[model samples]
Target: EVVKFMDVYQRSYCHPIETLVDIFQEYPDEIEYIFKPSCVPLMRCGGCCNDEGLECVPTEESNITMQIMRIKPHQGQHIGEMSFLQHNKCECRPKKD
Candidate 1:
């Protein structure tokens, strides 16, 4: 038998990126200012996007700890641990001087 499951361990949220299109219409320069310091294509630079017409995207660490919580019951694993381990290996139980 096959098992169907959804993982809430590292769930993220989303919203319209252009939160303030009209504000930037009056201040085009501000948009340029925000873009320079925030976002790297897939990842936001953590709360600096207020420079542009978009809402400030805070760090994953902070965002997860805030009021947002999973709707259904979950195993509740640390959010970044899975993604990090998938992309990296660790020197676990290493010897030190």
Candidate 2:
């Protein structure tokens, strides 16, 4: 069935460590410590809506933690964690001022 309202959709997207480094370049040293550098699928919100003022957006979100390893030249390797937001629910809502 065709959807008539704003909703969340999945797209085949890959996020490699290289791309992620561009996003979080502030921590160049730490970003390089990402373990098993690979591509990951991320979700996005989008859909057809009648109202121009309304747009698909995440209504609920949760934190996703990723593990990484930090290695200092002389110091020993250390385990680290990174947190990112994951969209849990989506809905068409009026634009916020």
Candidate 3:
């Protein structure tokens, strides 16, 4: 299916190495990173009704926590799970004209 073709990849795509470099250079003592990108350019698959072009949503961004795993016994904080929707099919897909 089309979704099988276009699903997003793993955390590796989060640009881990580049982030690490920036962290070490800017705040050498800082061992952790908590970041959420300011803007994400996204769109619904098909053009809007009456053929309006690309649309975007400005996400209410928050810092995704970076918890460091420790060698010794560490206190685990309880953070609520993030619920999400997975659109398995493209409902807005247009018929071939």
Candidate 4:
């Protein structure tokens, strides 16, 4: 399949650390909230259409509480949960392509 072939091709050449580093460099502020949701008012909500190419709706304030687990990269995994109000909401949409 073309999709599967492309997926494997990308993964084969794209190193995780390097790929993530480039993403962080390209979207510092975006990666901030995405990587860390410890703070309130999530800047980037993870919920989006799987078929869409990174298209997302505008964020809105949310009152829902979420429990999260924190893990360090290349180290150890820790477990914890927190309840807090969200300050944003979003929807999946078509990409700008």
Which 10 successive residues of model 3 have the least lDDT summed?
12-21
Compute the lDDT of residue 46 as modeled in candidate 1. 21
Best of the candidates, TM-score = 2
Residue-wise C-alpha lDDT for candidate 2, range 1-97, written one tens digit per residue = 8754333222212111112333244344555444433332344444544478876677776766777555555656776676655666677678776
Q: Give the lDDT ranking, best first.
A: 2, 4, 3, 1
Compare candidates 2 and 3 on TM-score and give the better one: 2
Residue 2 of model 2 has an lDDT of: 75
lDDT of 1 at 24: 34
- Candidate 1 wrong stretches, greater than 4 Å: 1-9, 13-27, 30-40, 45-97
In the range 16-87, model 1's lDDT, one tens digit per residue, is: 121222323433554433221121112222222212334433223211111212222344422221010011
C-alpha lDDT (0 to 100) for residue 15 of candidate 2:
16
Per-residue alpha-carbon lDDT of candidate 3 for residues 1-97, written as tens digits (9 for 90 to 100): 3444224332212121212213233234433433222122222122222233423222232233233322222534332322122222232223344
Comparing 1 and 4 by TM-score, which wins? Answer: 4
For 1-97, candidate 4 gives per-residue lDDT tens digits of: 3669657555443121111112234335543233344443333444335463655554564443445445466666554444433325455556665
Worst 10 residues of 1 by lDDT: 80-89
Predicted structure 3: lDDT: 0.27
